[PDB]
Amino acid sequence: GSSGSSGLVKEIDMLLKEYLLSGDISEAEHCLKELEVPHFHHELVYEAIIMVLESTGESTFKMILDLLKSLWKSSTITVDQMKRGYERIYNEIPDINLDVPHSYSVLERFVEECFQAGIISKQLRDLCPSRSGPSSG
Numbered sequence: 001g002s003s004g005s006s007g008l009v010k011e012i013d014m015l016l017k018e019y020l021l022s023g024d025i026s027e028a029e030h031c032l033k034e035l036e037v038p039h040f041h042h043e044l045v046y047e048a049i050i051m052v053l054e055s056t057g058e059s060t061f062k063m064i065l066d067l068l069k070s071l072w073k074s075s076t077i078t079v080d081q082m083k084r085g086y087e088r089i090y091n092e093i094p095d096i097n098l099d100v101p102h103s104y105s106v107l108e109r110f111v112e113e114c115f116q117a118g119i120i121s122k123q124l125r126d127l128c129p130s131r132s133g134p135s136s137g
Helices: 009-022 025-034 038-054 058-073 079-099 103-117 122-127
Strands: none
Touching (some): 009 038, 025 058, 038 079, 038 103, 103 122
């Protein structure tokens, strides 16, 4: 097969992987910029969200949450570059709802915090998928 340097989209992933293994937004920040690939930003955000839905434990939820936040405020990610990430998910959530049922919920929770942080728009906050079911007290 391919030993290494097979796909580019992978570059983004790896970065996030190390960010979670190390736990330092600063590091990721540099790594990203070091990739000199701005056109490959919309993907990053998309992957991050997938990490929280795919992975279990408030851990990823937090780290990832802050990751996107900081990076954004760090004039690294533009509104759009961020909006795209969410959209793809809201539309690609169907395939994720297969293995990840809570996905819908987990996503709503993650997106919520983001909105408050002031990184996304009301369009995204709402766009997020919402299915009535367990929601009960």
